[PDB]
């Protein structure tokens, strides 16, 4: 049972989240998650951009960015698109507010992503989950809720640490107080196999609703894939791919991370 397996580690992730909403553990992981995560984040953004464009031959109308922080990732899709409805939610009033003196165009709310449908009735095209999964006290709850917002074509993208990962994961670590805050948020982390077991479940009962998880770096999909394929056509991706030769390297060093997608299509 996924569920079990979910509150059994919820003291993982509660212990993980201190490292967000703590003053002083908070400093260390925006430090951490700018030096070490920035450049994934538009090749992230692409992968979806890149899937919706060739799933669904349109680009989306809206993108809802669950955990969005300091709203990184909607000022990178204010800079490609002007004509998308962008909305963020994150618990963290300090993420929020430093996100709304932004003055982009897009909506920003202060609340447990538990509670998005207070805030968004219109369906979403894209609901992106970066790098935060781990960090809910109810990860399946917030799933199932996020479904309910899905368009009639449409993805949630979810990227994630593998808690196998661990090991590999604390080489980037430069402080005792970096390497305690990866412990703590590999140990929160799912495994490819929860996160499998996770997508069936929430995915299994509902209509024209699949799922796909992998740990290849392209959004998850081999790249003997049909789907590898068609995603590098699109020059976005390739254009976020060819970055600096440090952040290069730097992709090539990380350990995988979760890729899942749950794909509606009516
Ligand atoms: N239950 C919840 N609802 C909304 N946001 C949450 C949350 N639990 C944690 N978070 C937020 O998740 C963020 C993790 S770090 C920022 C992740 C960001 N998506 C990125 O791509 O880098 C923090 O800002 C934290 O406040
Ligand atoms: C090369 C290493 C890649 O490292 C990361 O992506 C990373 C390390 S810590 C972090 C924060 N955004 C919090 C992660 C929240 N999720 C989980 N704990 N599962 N991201």
């Given at each position: 049972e996924i569920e079990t397996i979910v509150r059994e580690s919820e003291a993982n992730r509660i212990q993980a989240q201190?490292?967000?909403?703590?003053?002083?553990?908070?400093?260390?992981?925006?430090?951490?998650?700018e030096r070490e995560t920035s450049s994934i984040r538009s090749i992230s953004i692409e992968t979806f951009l890149s899937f919706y464009s060739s799933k669904f031959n349109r680009e989306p109308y809206s993108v809802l960015d669950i955990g969005c922080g300091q709203g990184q990732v909607i000022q990178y899709l204010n800079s490609r698109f002007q004509k998308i409805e962008l909305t963020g939610i994150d618990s963290s009033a300090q993420a929020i507010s430093?996100?709304?003196?932004?003055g982009i165009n897009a909506s920003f709310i202060c609340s447990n992503a538990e509670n998005i449908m207070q805030y968004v009735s219109k369906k979403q095209d894209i609901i992106f989950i970066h790098l935060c999964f781990g960090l809910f006290k109810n990860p399946i709850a917030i799933v199932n809720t996020l479904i309910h917002l899905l368009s009639d074509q449409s993805c949630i993208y979810i990227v994630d640490l593998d808690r196998n990962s661990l090991g590999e994961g604390l080489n980037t670590a430069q402080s005792r107080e970096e390497e305690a805050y990866?412990?703590?948020?590999?140990?929160?982390?799912?495994?490819?196999?929860?996160?499998?077991?996770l997508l069936h479940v929430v995915t299994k009962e509902q209509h024209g609703v699949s799922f796909h998880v992998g740990n290849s770096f392209i959004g998850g999909f081999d790249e003997t894939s049909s789907q590898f394929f068609s995603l590098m056509r699109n020059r976005n991706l390739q254009d976020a791919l060819r970055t600096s030769v440090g952040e290069q390297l730097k992709q090539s060093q990380m350990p995988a991370l979760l890729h899942g997608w749950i794909i509606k299509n009516k």
């Amino acid at each position: 049972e996924i569920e079990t397996i979910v509150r059994e580690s919820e003291a993982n992730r509660i212990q993980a989240q201190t490292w967000f909403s703590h003053p002083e553990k908070s400093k260390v992981s925006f430090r951490y998650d700018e030096r070490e995560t920035s450049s994934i984040r538009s090749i992230s953004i692409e992968t979806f951009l890149s899937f919706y464009s060739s799933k669904f031959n349109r680009e989306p109308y809206s993108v809802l960015d669950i955990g969005c922080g300091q709203g990184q990732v909607i000022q990178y899709l204010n800079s490609r698109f002007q004509k998308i409805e962008l909305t963020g939610i994150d618990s963290s009033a300090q993420a929020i507010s430093s996100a709304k003196k932004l003055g982009i165009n897009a909506s920003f709310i202060c609340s447990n992503a538990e509670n998005i449908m207070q805030y968004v009735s219109k369906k979403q095209d894209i609901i992106f989950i970066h790098l935060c999964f781990g960090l809910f006290k109810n990860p399946i709850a917030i799933v199932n809720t996020l479904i309910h917002l899905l368009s009639d074509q449409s993805c949630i993208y979810i990227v994630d640490l593998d808690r196998n990962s661990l090991g590999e994961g604390l080489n980037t670590a430069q402080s005792r107080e970096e390497e305690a805050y990866l412990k703590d948020q590999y140990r929160a982390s799912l495994t490819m196999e929860e996160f499998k077991q996770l997508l069936h479940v929430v995915t299994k009962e509902q209509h024209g609703v699949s799922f796909h998880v992998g740990n290849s770096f392209i959004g998850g999909f081999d790249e003997t894939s049909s789907q590898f394929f068609s995603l590098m056509r699109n020059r976005n991706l390739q254009d976020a791919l060819r970055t600096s030769v440090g952040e290069q390297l730097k992709q090539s060093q990380m350990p995988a991370l979760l890729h899942g997608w749950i794909i509606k299509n009516k």
